[PDB]
Amino acid sequence: MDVLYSLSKTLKDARDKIVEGTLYSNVSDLIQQFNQMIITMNGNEFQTGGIGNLPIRNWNFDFGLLGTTLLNLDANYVETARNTIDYFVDFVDNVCMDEMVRESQRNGIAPQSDSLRKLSGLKFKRINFDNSSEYIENWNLQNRRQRTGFTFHKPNIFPYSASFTLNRSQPAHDNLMGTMWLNAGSEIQVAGFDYSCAINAPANTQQFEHIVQLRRVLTTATITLLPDAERFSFPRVINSADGATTWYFNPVILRPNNVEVEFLLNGQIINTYQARFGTIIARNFDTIRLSFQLMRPPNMTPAVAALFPNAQPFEHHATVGLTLRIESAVCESVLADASETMLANVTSVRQEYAIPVGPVFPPGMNWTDLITNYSPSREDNLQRVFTVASIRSMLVK
């Protein structure tokens, strides 16, 4: 594996640092590394593909080496080189792709393809170098074992979930109390509604709560917390819990009272914020708990008083809400986020080559399904597959 990596930074730091004119010296340490490779190769043969609409190409080697004591590289030098690189390019592509679809369960964390199973071989280790590509940097540390980790923008930790829970309801659905929410990606919006505007509630206050359990711990999270859930601030006709009928939601929004956000880790409060809107830091957590209340306004102008009668029908439904967005965070496990193309690369290669559904990943590499049941096997396969996608993107985008 680590093998694979090199094969690339080799070419990039190559197809990049080797141009018409450059003084020699800044490549001496480079040329060398390069050649070393060629040697190890030439002689051994390779097999690529064999599944679905995946071509089956064969490969051989025997390419001259490279000059040493020159000075300034003449055009002629380049072309006689680019022609030798373009075989490795078109190669690696066919290599990544081949091991970017195979999956195993017992040991689906390691190499699979007849291409790679031969790379982990010992006579090959003669290449590994310059491991500064964020992903490999993390692959290794995981191998030896330790505080791994990655960087994500608007991470994708919440499987899509859009639903409601009626804590008080009746057939006519004319006096409900409960919550409705949308958990998706890095965002949570939750609203608590009470058709009665806490008219008969103790202290004229109705308590609400929304708990979200992450499938993986997030550390060093920068989070935006804002009052109100715009998504649940408009009139809706919704299906009943049993699907037998539809109810009407006609919200009027009040400020959430006694807002308390807790970021817990294994049941323990790690961070807690009381009514603090704006930017907050949650340093280590696997659960978010949002508690907020609807408090019936003790003083109301006529226009307001008119919305909240002492008796039904309740036509304006008091609603309070919160919006929470994880802008950035670190996770010890790979995840999809709003900036990295890994998930899209893996999903795209599989779709383009009509790769059959396997035993590990959900059909279509569906993110919601994947994160909902993020088993150790799916994570090991995902990491292997994401690391390969990142190696590929150094050369082919």
Binding site: I31, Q32, G67, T68, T69
Partner: protein, 245 residues
């Protein structure tokens, strides 16, 4: 300049040496009689200690070859010569553990002299080549179906100095022609032959002693008159009677 190079590695990065040694530093073990490992490894160490210096050696050559080389016009493809050149490991071994803080190089004047020679030589080769070609080609459009073979070749090689013809397999000399008879020709050379041919005819008839053929009519024929010769029997035009080369 096809001048087969070699590892910057070797060059001065030397280490290969350092590795050649480190690999030696862990070969000290059993198997047969004692008068063996004793004698063996002891020798090895003499390479090790000296290694600090052996380094220097690599540097030396590295440079020298890498230097001298430069001044060579004569391209140089790698070939399997037919003759060796004996090298007694004797000397080798000496050079090895026997070099200190010595440091020598090519005297300026020395270098030039080197260039100069290959130069001349080259020039000669190239030049005679042209001299050669030019001739042979002419040789064909002149129908001089005769020498074409050896003749020219002989002179050629001679002027090149270096080899004593004779001992040249007959398959070689001719094969040599076969290759020569397939090249252009120093515009200079060529440009002149074209010139000579165009006037050729004109010279030949324009001479005082000698003219082209005679005709027979067995027909009491009328003699012509031309100012320069008086009453003579010429005729600048043969047409109407077979021609026999």
């Amino acid at each position: 300049n096809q001048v087969l190079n070699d590892n910057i590695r070797n060059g001065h990065v030397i280490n290969q040496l350092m590795e050649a040694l480190m690999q030696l530093s862990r070969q000290q073990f059993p198997t047969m009689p004692v008068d063996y490992k004793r004698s063996i490894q002891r020798g090895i160490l003499l390479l090790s200690n000296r290694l600090g210096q052996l380094v220097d050696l690599t540097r030396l050559l590295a440079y020298n070859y890498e230097t001298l080389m430069a001044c060579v016009t004569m391209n140089m493809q790698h070939v399997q010569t037919l003759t060796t050149e004996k090298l007694q490991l004797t000397s080798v071994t000496s050079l090895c553990m026997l070099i200190g803080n010595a440091t020598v190089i090519p005297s300026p004047q020395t270098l030039f002299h080197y260039y100069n020679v290959n130069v001349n030589f080259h020039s000669n080769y190239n030049e005679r080549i042209n001299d050669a070609v030019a001739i042979i080609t002419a040789a064909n459009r002149l129908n001089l179906y005769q020498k074409k073979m050896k003749a020219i070749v002989e002179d050629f090689l001679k002027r090149l100095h270096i080899f004593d013809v004779a001992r040249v397999p007959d398959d070689q000399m001719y094969r040599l022609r076969d290759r020569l008879r397939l090249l252009p020709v120093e515009v200079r050379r060529l440009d002149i032959f074209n010139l000579i041919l165009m006037n050729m005819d004109q010279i030949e008839r324009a001479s005082d002693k000698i003219a082209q053929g005679v005709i027979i009519a067995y027909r009491d024929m009328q003699l012509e008159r031309d100012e320069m010769y008086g009453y003579v029997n010429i005729a600048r035009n043969l047409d109407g009677f077979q021609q026999i080369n």
